[PDB]
């Protein structure tokens with residue numbers, strides 16, 4: 016059931032912003048590793064004396080990488096005279112974030128009809144304000160509320176190219192990389208206590224629980240058309256193998272964003288391209304499931320995927336799970352930086368055609384059991 | 397003249413350590429951009445709860461990338477019980493360094509006969525101590541003194557593979573990249589006042605002035621065999637075009653390391669390989685000199701380089717200068733990170749055969765005049 020109870024009009028995921036120590040090096044690594052193009056910049060060469068911000072795009076996916084300059088460059092500025100292109104930015108908040116959590120997501124940004132009203136309504140409904148609505152060049156409005164930990168939910172609305180004050184990047188520095196990634200499917204938070212986190216976020220958004228069907232409990236919040244998907248996890252304590260949610264909270268110094276799931280229009284090509292680059296500057300992937308997992312795929316999805324397509328999943332280490340509505344292919348990277356905290360998921364969904372409805376196939380929860388049974392069977396051989 | 401006045405026995409440049417916010421992303425970017433292999437690590441997977449350190453190598457060149465974990469992981473430790481593989485490391489010093497300077501070089505490390513005696517003698521001769529000698533696993537001794545700004549000169553000595561506590565990296569994560577870079581030729585500091593910087597460093601090392609022959613004055617300190625080369629620059633103020641040394645000091649918040657010159661055994665291949673990767677995660681280069689600069693090369697070095705070799709320099713944007721002893725080919729990257737501070741030089745030297753003596757060809761100082769005259773001539777066409 017979908018009660019469609021959004022308290023404001025929400026469109027789609029707009030962008031994800033990483034707070035970094037050096038935005039240049041993170042952005043160049045991610046660009047090569049994920050096949051994203053340099054699309055826009057706001058830095059010293061555009062008159063920004065406050066922060067360096069570089070935007071990568073692939074299809075509709077937008078990754079923003081921001082780091083602070085020396086405060087000395089902007090010491091004479093005040094907020095009314097700021098050269099920052101993102102007015103919510105603050106040197107002290109950014110350094111403290113990165114000092115505390117390491118490299119990670121500061122902002123999950125969604126495009127809304129009216130960022131000011133979304134902010135007003137959210138705060139009227141319990142959201143903790145982080146940055147009030149600010150209108151950029153009479154053209155774009157941006158506002159922020161606390162989501163969990165030090166992550167903000169950022170609202171953006173356009174009267175009618177990323178943000179005012181950003182410049183298009185020179186063609187020569189913009190190499191048209193593309194490994195098939197097209198959009199953000201969902202963004203996942205880790206918290207110590209799922210209940211209060213859910214109540215808070217669903218409280219101020221009107222997002223509803225999205226129906227599902229070790230080491231965690233989780234629930235997914237969704238917008239009216241279920242294209243904005245915000246799962247949240249808590250750990251399950253005192254188990255056998257220590258909870259990876261608990262490991263996250265320890266190394267991250269508390270709650271924060273756990274993984275970003277990026278939809279590919281051709282997950283075979285995406286993973287071929289990402290895996291060729293894993294050891295030359297790109298991203299590493301979790302160890303592949305054993306061959307027993309792929310033998311078991313015939314009985315589970317043999318009607319969806321041919322044997323050759325299954326052998327292709329085996330080559331690339333792809334996981335497969337299935338709903339009552341659709342089928343999903345997925346794989347997880349190793350952590351994106353030094354700490355065992357944030358990682359990336361690549362996802363492609365089969366089914367639920369009407370366009371494709373969101374969450375088609377679910378989120379792969381059945382793969383914990385399947386991989387475990389596969390592990391037992393592989394030891395048996 | 398070389399008075400050979402080293403106060404302790406110095407061998408060669410050993411490694412350069414970058415202090416980072418996330419060592420993983422900087423190291424992966426540099427590896428792809430410069431063609432350096434992942435050689436060793438010290439991190440959570442090796443039992444280091446304090447810092448993440450990753451070593452890249454190409455030939456004899458060693459780049460170390462280090463970042464701090466959350467202090468909470470090592471809160472129960474004391475220095476006698478530390479899990480840090482580099483005992484001079486300190487969370488607060490590293491965060492403060494990076495907060496203040498951004499991404500840059502913390503340590504210029506030279507291999508000496510006896511790091512304890514080198515430290516003792518240096519401090520007896522005016523060096524400011526930074527970290528005292530510590531013997532690692534009865535095998536390697538490391539000590540540090542202040543060089544300029546927040547950069548240290550690190551002494552390392554071996555009784556008889558990088559440092560104890562580091563592990564060799566798994567073959568699969570170690571892709572054998574190689575674009576021809578072989579060793580560190582020299583490492584250059586920027587300071588507000590050259591005189592006191594020179595007197596201090598030459599004071600405690602015994603390094604002598606290495607004979608030479610806009611915006612800067614400079615001088616080069618050298619070890620006995622002139623294989624360790626430490627140039628230092630100060631700005632020249634009130635000019636026409638603002639001094640790039642002054643621009644460095646402003647954006648770096650004071651003195652620090654300006655550039656690293658990396659010797660290539662085949663600068664044509666190095667630059668071909670680096671330029672292919674500039675816009676896909678690698679490094680950018682300074683804008684090429686105009687064709688007039690390359691026409692003028694025939695009269696300057698036509699006896700050293702064939703016309704085809706000169707046309708190859710033109711293709712790759714390589715600069716050429718010449719001594720009374722030898723010829724050097726050089727090129728400069730754009731800044732390595734967000735700030736207009738540290739950059740890299742690629743260098744190859746022709747001549748001074750006996751092995752090749754250090755500094756053969758000088759450091760390219762004649763290229764300021766040559767490029768300026770070349771600019772005037774190119775506008776004329």
Ligand SMILES: CCOCCn1c(C(F)(F)F)nc2ccc(C(=O)c3c(C)nn(C)c3O)c(C)c2c1=O
Nearest residue numbers: 203233235246301347358360378379380382383386
């Ligand atoms: C990264 C290192 O972990 C590898 C272990 N692992 C395994 C494995 F391989 F063990 F089966 N299966 C998974 C299946 C789904 C999801 C996931 O995306 C999800 C979940 C669950 N709920 N919601 C709302 C989601 O979006 C995730 C993270 C995993 C996962 O992490």
Ligand SMILES: CCOCCn1c(C(F)(F)F)nc2ccc(C(=O)c3c(C)nn(C)c3O)c(C)c2c1=O
Nearest residue numbers: 584614616627682728739741759760761763764767
């Ligand atoms: C990076 C942006 O600057 C580009 C402008 N530029 C030019 C240009 F192109 F203008 F001619 N020529 C140079 C020649 C030599 C050196 C250099 O390595 C050196 C110097 C001088 N003294 N010592 C001890 C050295 O090692 C350097 C930096 C440059 C340089 O920076």
Ligand SMILES: [Co+2]
Nearest residue numbers: 203276360378
């Ligand atoms: Co997921």
Ligand SMILES: [Co+2]
Nearest residue numbers: 584657741759
């Ligand atoms: Co140089």
